[PDB]
């Protein structure tokens, strides 16, 4: 209680990757002969982020050398990761052969169940109230290298004696070499971190493969003479970072200014970029023999799995004061504190420890700031209103020692308040009417609002719209989700459907479908609403998407929606969140 | 008593393997002519694992960097491992013949004694309450590699002088090379540690053997004439973490939100995969000559012995509330404490320290909070009952200096209790009924609940039944155990039995048999119930399965089976667990 | 409070990079006939510096070891660095092919996608009053080198033995061989950090490629038979810290003399050379065969991108009194400060915690010394104004403990003040008229002002001019802006603009266009105000430049324009900053 406040909480992030999702050809080289399989088994990304908020100063603080700022912290580190990121428990393979007779070309092939080709994490603010200030790592590695540079001379001499049936010979020889060689050494790992600085908004670190990262770079054969079959792939070479687990480790440090005001959307993008092996043999013939060489496959099929979240920072919540906020209680009720109304007009409530309007941050000058609007104080000149701040020395109360009693500093009179109504006023002494008894408390503003969830994919620009006062939800559908909005006149998205209207009261939960739309792109292609009563209703079709995936939000107990975020660009809708209360 | 408190206890994990399951076929080439044997002696289980709950934050901290939750710590670590795991004390080899004379195919054998091929520990939370939040070793390696890349060349020139009888010779010769090569550095180890991340509430680490992980590998000749016969394997690469010792040592904590509630099951499987090493000469005939080839069977068998244990969580356990709670003594009376029922309503009970109904926590605001209920504080408005949490003034509590007296900040009266009912009330003074001596201590509501052992295995889906009020199990029992449950149309798991029932009352132990199912795979065979009067009562059957292990549950002096917890899939069951009280 | 104060704000550096600005040649070896292509994607500077200002001791600290001095400190650190640098998110490349036939030239090229071949920082005093004192890094490296000096010989015999039809030969050989080689070990960097120290205002910092700095260092092929067609650049080289993010990290400290005044200006020029990347292959032409040899083209062309700001020091400023300053509150009044003017008469005013002039330093000898003007103090001998500095005893203050009196340590009386006027003097005891009630508290001198958007480039000679009394900017415009100045005769710059005249009063925004010049260098070319009332004006062109980039700089509601900073040459200015208040 004399340090600086925090908001801290976590975010789970857990998504479950389908069988199909997973999905390949068993074959590149004769891709639709071959058929096609899941290439990891129960595949799944659980992660937990921890985010806090704070101002970079404590309340009042002055002339320190760091930087006034509201800092915003995105962190997944030795404190909190999470399970991590798993496709698969081992890796086996599958072989296939040309159906075909075959003299020169490739006729066998491997497909090796998937790894991940990298992870990758993207951090986005939404507006730019928030600038990226600083992360970890910080940077991509500049990398050290040793060179070495070598040269040298041999000066040798032979002396020879034969002997034989012919007669004796004898040689005499000389030699000098000049020898020089250059040596380069450097590091690569499994995974390297690279680091993506797009703008001030935003950024994004991905493990991505280094060492072993093509298909040929797991091969441990060259060429083989033809009667030889056998899997030409050292599968040691693939890490269980590779599909077993991975944990990433990282901080996005967000700052926005000292005075900034509104709020502004932080979004999480994880996702694994699920890659299937292929590598081939291929018959050479030329007259004189033949053999068999191996190869890689690189440009083959990938598959990105991505699990959105995000959260919403309101850079004008208390704990941004970087003060720890106190209530003043009028002592004569069992439960009644002084309240502001938006005005600052001043009432006498019961109670509320998380109310910020009973709050009040209590400063070096002994004024009582309000945590919620600090540009108002209590001031004695005038008890039916929070006053603009200043050095009003009525604004500065002290508490008389071992009593109950507040007094102002300017005229020593204490805060009294009406036994009946609470109203409050400066007074000498008590009376039968005024009581001058005054209790004060630490109160709990810090508490972190849990966040929606997103339905659907984070790409496009991003919308946001208050939902109506008829309380619906208008849709243009048809293959997919066309466009949303809280009126018919507000759609995001594009043009294609046919319009139609949701009624958002009594909604129990909501379910949405996406993927890899038939027509184009990854789009979200249908929302199914079901209701308190049990009716359900749907608009879109789960029909013309491959590769689908659902996405479950179920409301807590009698909430209502709120606001909207819509993802779109100006053909289709590709994700939503419903924003509660 | 300034401190956050935990729940602290030890998890023994003890099992013997017998010499039955420590047996193989003497030999792979000729599996059934050459007999079988143990592969180790007196192999065994002995880990101690410990475990701490507790909440992430004191009661009543506000604004901490650290996210509000509940967490639940299982490690095996510096401070406590237990004696390890053990499989032989040295290692030694049978050889073994072709029976049949040979030309041309594999003619000898040399079987070794066995090794941990990996050591396995799984992490498993029974619900979805609870979700992995670290662990230790945070993940596997991320690998680091050294290239080298060399190149140079090389010019030389040789000055020669030949005379013989023949007649004088002389050479001038000139030379020049090229060279290039790529180096590749990297680490192994004896076992490699690696992580399974299979989801948000499982998580496993598997010491996997890596360098040396094949029986080719351990052999040190490649090649030899037919009349060598020797041992063809370098027993020096086979390392005593590999059979006499090994001791595992990880983290793994979970976290629960900060107001979950109920329960979830924490399931440990320990285990070691026991594998016999075989490998062979193979005879070669090609016309010329005839030699020797060595090497090693990979494709062998393996067996897995396996030790659970399980402990159990209530997120409603007053370790969670973070606080230290003390009980207030109405100290008129020898031994008599406040203590709160379901409902909330007090009566003034013996005083017992280990009560959790008798226990407060005294807040930041000078509240008396249950901790069996942290959502009820005792309440001076109303002395008959604890009320629900808030800023009432009459909720808040002081200490009158150097007196064993307790007054209400609201009033100022002082707490008070009837020298005969031990009533509650707020008096201004004491007088003949009424005493107004309050005494209090901190109390032990720490401590932790012993658990029940795991019969079998657990492996299929688990359920969870509570034990009817007719206080019996109901069986399908045949040659194994088909079914378990707490009535007859609550059975978990297959069909095929014959329906029975046993008594639950009055037993004094119970002992399960298990293991490899003649029919298929491993299962539960037979329970055995013994009563406190001595009659004895089996369901199930001892003579259909092999490489079987005993688990013996004596239950202490009279406690009642309440739960029942069973591993089972859709044809047998596979474990029970039996919960007291 | 009792610890050196500091002035403490971060700057951003944001830098939108156009495509245009992004674009090259598609070709070197055929310029004009194969067009041109943006060579990044979104290239983008988002940097965040992190200022400090303070004394280097303490006020009033005698006999340190640490000399008397203002202190300037610039950093990008582990605590701030902004987002980074960013110029692509992957590498591609275009092939080209000659159009004519070829039997011995340049046949084939590829032109890669560009990466930074450096990044480049510059920190620039604008006058001498700052010198440079230290940085980090503090130097360029000295590299350490390992030299090896090996040297042998060998000795050898052969013995032969040759049995033929012809008959027995027999041969007895002797070899001497002496060797002599030396190595040369060191290291280098992708990115080697060169400091250039221009002088004792001006530093700069350069992240330049070392390893793999040229197009030859990226070649992995040197030559091929003429059917190879294939990228000869292994691209795996070249660093994501090359493109995707890279964030310096310096520090720059100046220093100004303990005495200095007035005010210098500080000039951080941070910037991108983006480098394409052209490598061909040569048909080789010889009678006997023919081969394909690869290159790298070096003296292709590049383009510096760069973001300049700047911030203003008043070593004026309270901040680098190294002390605390206070107020002195006359407490009849509700809100009334002691106030001193330029010539340091003292009046009472309303209270201004920022307010400079009501700031006081209370000293080790218990002197009020002015914050804004340390050679004066509060005088008890004459309190209708400050005095100069001295021992004088009536320059020295005590407070009454436990009261709100402050006496005069010579005479013992203390301080008073007018209830109506404020007017101060000296008494023995209080009465009608007169209050010794003084109040005192810490005030907040230490914000800092913001600084203004610099238009254009920093380059040329800087020059500084006072607003007119008229309120109007000059102008000589033409094809670019050829000078400007605070009045006609004033005019920094060049001489051949028609000269024109703009209106500074009810200015809401600016916007500067600069770039290449079509006629010579790079120069602002035009500007645009835009008024209150919505009218516009411009003047320079627009259409004279390439490259072209645009400054927008919005004033903040009704501040005036007070001062001009200018950047130019003999011919024409090349950059301005419009100073506010």
Not at 124 to 146: G, M, R
Request: net charge negative; aromatic share 10%; proline share 3%.
């Amino acid at each position: 209680t004399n340090t600086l406040p925090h908001v801290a909480f976590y975010i789970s992030v857990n998504r479950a990757i389908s069988d199909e999702e997973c999905t390949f050809n068993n074959s590149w080289l004769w891709k639709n002969e071959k058929g096609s399989r899941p290439f990891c088994k129960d595949a799944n990304i659980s992660l937990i982020y921890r985010v806090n908020l704070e101002r970079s100063l404590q309340y009042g603080i002055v002339g320190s050398a760091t930087p006034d700022a509201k800092i915003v912290r995105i962190s997944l580190d030795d404190d909190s990761t999470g399970a991590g990121i798993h496709l698969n428990d081992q890796l086996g393979y599958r072989q296939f052969g040309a159906s075909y007779t075959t003299l020169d070309a490739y006729f066998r092939e491997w497909s090796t169940d998937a790894i991940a080709q990298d992870y990758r994490f993207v951090f986005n603010a939404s507006n730019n109230k928030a600038q990226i200030l600083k992360t970890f790592p910080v940077d991509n590695i500049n990398e050290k290298f040793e060179r070495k540079e070598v040269s040298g001379f041999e000066l040798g001499v032979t002396g020879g004696v034969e002997v034989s049936g012919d007669g004796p010979k004898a040689k005499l020889e000389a030699r000098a070499s000049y020898t020089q060689s250059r040596w380069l050494t450097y590091n690569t790992q499994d995974y390297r971190i690279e680091r993506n600085a797009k703008n001030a908004q935003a950024v994004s670190f991905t493990w991505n493969r280094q060492q072993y990262a093509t298909a040929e770079s797991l091969l441990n054969r060259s060429t083989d003479a033809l009667w030889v079959n056998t899997y030409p792939v050292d599968v040691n070479r693939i890490s269980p970072l590779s599909y077993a687990s991975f944990v990433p480790k990282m901080d996005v440090i967000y700052k926005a200014s000292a005075t900034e005001t509104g709020s502004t959307d932080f979004i999480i993008d994880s996702s694994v970029n699920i890659r299937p092996i292929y590598n081939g043999a291929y018959k050479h013939y030329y007259v004189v023999g033949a053999h068999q060489s191996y190869h890689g496959f690189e440009d083959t099929p990938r598959r990105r799995i991505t699990k959105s979240a995000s959260f919403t920072v309101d850079w004008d919540h208390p704990v941004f004061t970087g003060g720890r906020p106190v209530n003043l209680q009028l002592a004569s009720f069992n439960n009644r504190c002084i309240q502001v109304d938006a005005q600052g007009r001043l009432t006498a409530n019961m109670c509320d420890s998380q109310q910020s309007a009973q709050s009040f941050i209590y400063d070096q000058l002994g004024r009582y700031v309000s945590a919620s609007n600090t540009k108002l104080c209590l001031d004695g000149a005038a008890l039916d209103a929070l006053q603009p701040c200043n050095q009003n020395l009525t604004q500065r109360w002290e508490w008389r020692k071992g009593t109950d009693e507040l007094t102002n500093v300017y005229s020593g009179e204490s805060l009294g308040h009406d036994k009946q109504t609470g109203e409050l006023g400066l007074y000498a002494s008590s009376n039968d009417a005024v009581s001058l008894r005054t209790i004060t408390a630490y109160t709990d503003v810090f508490n972190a609002q849990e966040s929606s969830p997103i339905l659907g994919y984070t790409q496009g620009k991003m919308n946001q719209q208050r939902v109506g006062q008829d309380n619906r939800l208008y849709v243009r559908a048809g293959a997919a989700i066309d466009a949303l909005g809280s009126a018919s006149d507000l759609l995001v998205g594009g043009n294609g459907g046919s319009l139609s209207s949701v009624d958002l009261s009594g909604v129990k939960s909501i379910t949405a479908t996406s993927g890899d739309f038939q027509y184009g792109g990854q789009q979200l292609v249908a929302l199914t609403f079901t209701y308190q009563d049990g009716r359900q209703q749907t608009v879109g079709s789960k029909a013309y998407v491959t590769n689908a995936h659902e996405d479950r939000f179920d409301l807590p107990d009698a909430a209502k929606i709120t606001q909207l975020k819509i993802w779109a660009d100006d053909w289709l809708v590709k994700g939503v969140q419903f924003d509660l209360n």
